[PDB]
Amino acid sequence: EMEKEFEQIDKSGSWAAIYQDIRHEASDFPSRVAKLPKNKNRNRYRDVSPFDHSRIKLHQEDNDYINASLIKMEEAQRSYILTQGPLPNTVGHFWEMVWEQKSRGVVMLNRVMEKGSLKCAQYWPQKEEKEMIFEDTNLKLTLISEDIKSYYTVRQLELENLTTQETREILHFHYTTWPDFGVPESPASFLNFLFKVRESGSLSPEHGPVVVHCSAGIGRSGTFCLADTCLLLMDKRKDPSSVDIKKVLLEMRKFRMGLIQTADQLRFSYLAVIEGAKFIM
Ligand SMILES: Cc1sc2ncnc(N(C)C)c2c1C
């Protein structure tokens, strides 16, 4: 049982050691499309690339590339798109991906500015009456409503395909209180946020995969889909304590490199799953 594994690693202070064994064991697949010179300005970080086998392709004949990966968790029946925070020049590609993949939710785990630098383009409207038009991808985005709470904001957005005049409602879930340095002290507000995204229907198989991002789409984004998948597997299995968080993380790392960036994020992921689990038992 992980609760005991948690105390063992914690009492021994072995988090940096566990984390290194995960780094060592992690899959390595080609990322040739990401490294093409015509795609250099489509990537926020030169060392964070989608694998070719799991990359999301845009349906535009010119350049199909976006820094985004499909994470398919077969046993949990959960899919996620993990992506980088859009760049000024990729905001249109981001919304094209949301449209083409039939996503119902976008989960954002960063602020636009952190540590005095821009982590992300402002890719949604700030006011009802000031909609955004993405000329390159022929999409219109309108803010419908905004509900600001202590730890997160939920926004209802309308995305319109200007080509076909179809419209869809997108839910934007913005976790606003992840600290600039390290991880939250308690997973309570993170778990409430998770169950809010679930209650929305955004993680359900009758929609396309949820889009999850932070700045790089690997660290906080990793913690989100690791906690969700682990908790779902505990519901599904005859023996809930058969769930090994290290094994689940390695399965997820087949689909996108570097998920969970620090030993602190790994410790936080264990805490989140343990607390969530105990919130059933
Ligand atoms: C950590 C949280 S928040 C939340 N909201 C509604 N239902 C829940 N259960 C019991 C599945 C939870 C859990 C386990």
The DSSP string of 203-249 is TSTTSBPEEEESSSSSSHHHHHHHHHHHHHHHHHSSSGGG--HHHHH
Q: 173 φ, ψ to 5°?
A: -105, 115
Q: Which residue, among 259, 266, 168, 212, has the nearest Cα to 78 in the 3D structure?
A: 212
The ligand 1 atom at the shortest distance from the C-alpha of residue 277 is: 14
For residue 94, give the DSSP letter: H
**How do strand 167-175 and strand 117-118 relate by DSSP bridges?**
unpaired
Say if CB 110 and CB 215 are below 8 A apart. Answer: yes
- Tell me the β-bridge partners of 260: none
The ligand 1 atom at the shortest distance from the C-alpha of residue 275 is: 1
Interatomic CA distance for residues 146 and 80, integer angstroms = 24
Q: What sign results for the dihedral spanned by CA atoms 119, 125, 130, 131?
A: positive
Say if CB 84 and CB 122 are below 8 A apart. Answer: no
Element (H, E) at 271: helix 263-278
- C-alpha of residue 175 to centroid of ligand 1, in Å: 17
Interatomic CA distance for residues 243 and 200, integer angstroms = 26
CA atoms lying within 13 Å on the CB side of residue 128 = 4
Tokens read off for 259: 């998920």
In short, whether 191's Cβ falls inside 6 Å of ligand 1 is yes
Asked if residue 230 belongs to a known ligand binding site, the reply is no
Other C-beta atoms within 10 Å of 96: how many? 21
Interatomic CA distance for residues 148 and 167, integer angstroms = 24
Q: How was this structure determined?
A: X-ray
- C-alpha of residue 142 to centroid of ligand 1, in Å: 31
Say if CB 20 and CB 9 are below 8 A apart. Answer: no
Cα torsion 182, 187, 190, 193 to 10°: value is -170
Q: Which residue, among 209, 230, 236, has the nearest Cα to 277 in the 3D structure?
A: 230
In short, whether 192's Cβ falls inside 6 Å of ligand 1 is yes
Breaks (C-N over 2.5 A) in the chain follow: none
Return the best residue to mutate from 195, 198, 228, 230 for the ligand 1 pocket (most ligand atoms within 8 A of CB): 195
Interatomic CA distance for residues 91 and 229, integer angstroms = 28
Q: 248 φ, ψ to 5°?
A: -60, -45
